[PDB]
């Protein structure tokens, strides 16, 4: 790694640096840095750029055990960038012209996500509290993006330590399109281990109702698939853990299901379209979902009240599934059981 690994992180620093940097923001991040401590943080940022130049941070944090799969680079001087991030936390503090930093702050968070990719240790420093990250947890779409950067941080975070990070967020309600992207949480299920009890609830179903709603205006087929992937992650979470709310999530799935397969039948085509290919993957997932529902139970009786509408979509889907490349035999076996 060494310098060659360092360049990729530096390029991420460059993207914030590039006019209007990344996302068309006017600030270069260094430009955003342009009180006395904040000026010192800007000096620190130049030093971090100097750290990027050395390439010392790359080929750093070598052990891959526990956190972020294959090991992240050391990203030494990530903390100096973090001090600049703390300065970003200081900007817009009164809110937490007006909120001018927010757009810069979101850019800083995106840079922070690149930094999180850059250092496994830097993620550890944020977990220790960092402290600014805890303040961010204490405090719109950019905020949803910041949560997504946190989700990348969670993937970086080692198991159990990540559970501690889930503990760090102040409230499940506080965690509760761009919001839909934030829903597509799923990372915590991906970080399987502790917090299974947190996944267990009191009455989730409301989120399933939102999936039934298809509220986001874009209503992208890929976006729907991402919601479906989040539901699949929830299904995986339920298996790790070991109802009427589950039926309500099923009801949202059914509204998607009647369109699924029948929409494919109307197309009468192999799913060349990426959304069409995504639908084919979703149909295989639905067959897998049916197998999961069979594993759950009781569950079938709740399924039965909405079952007749589901079945009319299902018979066409079963023919569609055998044809589809995305559909798989284990999902198909559940479909055969439905047959």
């Amino acid at each position: 790694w060494r310098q060659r690994s360092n360049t990729q992180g530096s390029i991420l620093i460059n993207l914030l640096l590039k006019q209007p940097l990344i996302p068309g923001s006017s600030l270069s991040l260094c430009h955003l840095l342009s009180s006395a401590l904040r000026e010192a943080q800007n000096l620190a940022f130049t030093g971090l750029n100097l750290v990027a130049r050395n390439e010392c941070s790359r080929d750093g944090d070598p052990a891959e055990g526990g956190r972020r799969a294959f090991p992240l680079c050391q990203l030494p001087g990530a903390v100096h960038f973090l001090p600049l991030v703390q300065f970003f936390i200081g900007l817009h503090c009164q809110a937490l012209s007006v909120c001018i930093l927010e757009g810069f702050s979101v850019t800083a968070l995106s840079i922070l996500q690149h930094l999180v990719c850059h250092s496994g240790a830097v993620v550890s420093l944020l977990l220790s509290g960092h402290p600014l990250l805890k303040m961010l947890l204490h405090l719109a779409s950019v905020l949803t993006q910041c949560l997504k950067v946190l989700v990348k941080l969670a993937e970086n975070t080692s198991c159990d330590f990540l559970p501690r990070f889930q503990c760090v967020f102040q409230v499940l309600p506080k965690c509760l399109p761009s919001v839909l992207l934030a829903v597509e949480l799923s990372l915590l299920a991906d970080h399987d281990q502790l917090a299974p009890q947190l996944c267990s609830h009191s009455e989730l179903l409301l989120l399933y109702m939102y999936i039934t709603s298809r509220p986001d205006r874009v209503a992208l087929e890929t976006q729907w698939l991402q919601l479906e992937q989040e539901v699949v992650w929830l299904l995986a979470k339920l298996g790790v853990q070991s109802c009427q709310c589950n039926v309500e999530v099923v009801r949202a799935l059914t509204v998607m299901l009647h369109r699924q397969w029948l929409t494919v039948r109307r197309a009468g085509g192999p799913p060349r379209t990426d959304q069409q290919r995504r639908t084919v993957r979703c149909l295989r997932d639905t067959v897998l979902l049916l197998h999961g529902l069979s594993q759950k139970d009781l569950f079938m009786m709740h399924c039965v009240e909405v079952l007749h509408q589901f079945d009319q979509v299902m018979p066409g889907v079963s023919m569609l599934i055998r044809g589809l490349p995305d559909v798989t035999d284990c999902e198909e076996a559940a479909l055969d059981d439905l047959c």
Partner: peptide, 11 residues
């Protein structure tokens, strides 16, 4: 007896 055909009617 299709049932699914009834669903098509529902559409």
């Amino acid at each position: 007896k299709s049932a699914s055909v009834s669903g098509a009617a529902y559409t």
